[PDB]
Amino acid sequence: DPKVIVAIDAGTVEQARAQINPLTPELCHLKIGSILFTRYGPAFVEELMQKGYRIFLDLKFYDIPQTVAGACRAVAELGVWMMNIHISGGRTMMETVVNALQSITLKEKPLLIGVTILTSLDGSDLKTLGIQEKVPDIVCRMATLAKSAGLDGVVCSAQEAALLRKQFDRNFLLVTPGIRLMTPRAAIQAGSDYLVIGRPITQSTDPLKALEAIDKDIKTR
Amino acid sequence: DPKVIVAIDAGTVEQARAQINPLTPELCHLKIGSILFTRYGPAFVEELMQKGYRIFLDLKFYDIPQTVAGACRAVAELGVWMMNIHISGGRTMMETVVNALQSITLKEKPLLIGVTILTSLDGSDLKTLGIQEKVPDIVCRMATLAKSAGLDGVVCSAQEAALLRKQFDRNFLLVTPGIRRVMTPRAAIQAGSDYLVIGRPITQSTDPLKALEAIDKDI
């Protein structure tokens, strides 16, 4: 079970394949997001799974309870390994999804991960939503809700993982993007369970070598 | 231009086709949401467009600016008529999407509509996040910022349309679901709706085309 999830954010399937080619499922899982999915749909996800990768399908659903439950169900029936939803969607939405996934046809259940506050929201953006308090706080608040609602974990920065890991012992998955060569070891040590890594690998002159180096770094004893 | 957008309720392709069969592109546009799109992808959207329909692709994007911009570009390239994004995503995200759509050398410009606070959420949800401000105040503010950022409009419930219309002239679209508390088509029109989003009143009627024709007249 590799701890690295490589973000594929190529705009075309030809470029995505070229980025995925030098990788190996022994060393990583793949994160596919809204760009590739909107352009190519479920069929591209199916191709990737047949190549032997587990897929974190990153569509950040945020809609009414029955729609999100229906969408997550579809993603689950696809065979997808991990998916995410906005905690902003509220308790009922989250609980409805959790309940819906218990009825899927696959024995192995997908991991359901919560999104808190995107790093792209600044102070005025938070105030637009009426959030008078600030990021570390509101994130910890949403994380607690996500847990209460039965989600398997949250996406969080490494700089947030140490804090949340104090709050949540296990099992609560901390999935952490924004890694740079916060380093892989630093993130894991803070409490991250999975590292989401993009350009350091995909824009490397030798992605395989880069991926191998991260794995070796993490496993250094 | 029809003013009704019929919400396609269905789960399956065949069930979706059955709902759509009695309608006509002359009398309505279609709203296709995350369930249908996640299950069947762009190919099903293309099938409907080939049947002559304009599509409101309802995926409610809420991601970082470059991701939403890239997604909205895919949607535009697919030829979609209307799409939506979460205003919660921030000003930078909105402006980035707006600019990305401007740079596109497509012919017809796909309408970019903002989502405010879902009707599935209320003050009780907000307070759980330590938000003490009232929903209608947040909604009005979000709508205002959407307008400022260059979005073409917002989705607002029919129940909500009257108070919102008071804030915006007809340059800013109000796209209104929640039609049959109970808000008729007539009532939604009086309130200020620009597009009526209607599901079961049409799709579940013994004669969907009959009902649709009847609604197009009141307007």
UniProtKB/Swiss-Prot annotation, chain B:
Subunit description: Homodimer.
GO BP, sorted A to Z: 'de novo' pyrimidine nucleobase biosynthetic process; 'de novo' UMP biosynthetic process
Pathway named in the protein's UniProt entry: Pyrimidine metabolism; UMP biosynthesis via de novo pathway; UMP from orotate: step 2/2
Function: Catalyzes the decarboxylation of orotidine 5'-monophosphate (OMP) to uridine 5'-monophosphate (UMP).
Keywords: Decarboxylase, Lyase, Pyrimidine biosynthesis
InterPro entries referenced in this protein's UniProt entry, alphabetically: Aldolase_TIM, OMPdecase, OMPdecase_AS, OMPdecase_bac, OMPdeCOase_dom, RibuloseP-bd_barrel
Listed GO CC annotations: cytosol
Signal sequence, renumbered to the chain: none
Provenance organism: Coxiella burnetii (strain RSA 493 / Nine Mile phase I)
Catalysed transformations (reactions): orotidine 5'-phosphate + H(+) = UMP + CO2
EC category: lyase
Residues annotated as catalytic: K60 (proton donor)
Xref: Gene3D superfamilies: Aldolase class I
Segments passing through the bilayer: none
Source domain of life: Bacteria
MF terms in GO: orotidine-5'-phosphate decarboxylase activity
E.C. number(s) listed in UniProt: 4.1.1.23
Family per record: Belongs to the OMP decarboxylase family. Type 1 subfamily.
Record-given protein name: Orotidine 5'-phosphate decarboxylase
Residues noted as binding substrate in the record, renumbered to the chain: 9, 31, 58-67, 119, 180, 199-200
